[PDB]
Design a protein around this ligand. Structure first.
Ligand SMILES: [Co+2]
Ligand SMILES: [Co+2]
Lengths: 81, 78
């Protein structure tokens, strides 16, 4: 997408990363924030959790999305919050 | 600055036994996915109106614009 929306960010991550839910996606076309839940993050460092997400966004991350800030939770970290 | 966290907090306070499972926003335009057992038997249009009313005076100026997807917990399970 030449002009990225928050609904893009949400669809692309859920498509690329199985069992993920983007519970919040915010931003203006250039700077975004996303809160991502995935049970696959269990036992993974914050850095790894973030990389799985950037990798799931594939070429969108490389070419379309200028900046993307993340909070990554397991479903359990989120419900126990 | 109004956030998707605000939207969720406000809908869940105002609309009883509802749950905002996801939300998007740019500061002015927002979307929320809302689950509530109440929505059973009600049309989409009715369910949207119920949520807008639940939000009360938040629509005046806090929330510039808001689209909705409204499901019963069950319909969401598929
Ligand atoms: Co910049
Ligand atoms: Co507007």
């Amino acid at each position: 997408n030449a002009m990225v929306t928050t609904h893009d960010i949400k669809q692309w991550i859920e498509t690329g990363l199985s069992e993920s839910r983007v519970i919040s996606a915010e931003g203006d076309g250039h700077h975004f924030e996303a809160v991502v839940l995935c049970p696959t993050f269990e036992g993974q460092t914050a850095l790894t959790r973030h990389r799985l997400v950037y990798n799931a966004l594939g070429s969108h991350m490389q070419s379309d999305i200028h900046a993307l800030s993340l909070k990554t939770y397991t479903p359990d970290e989120y419900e126990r919050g």
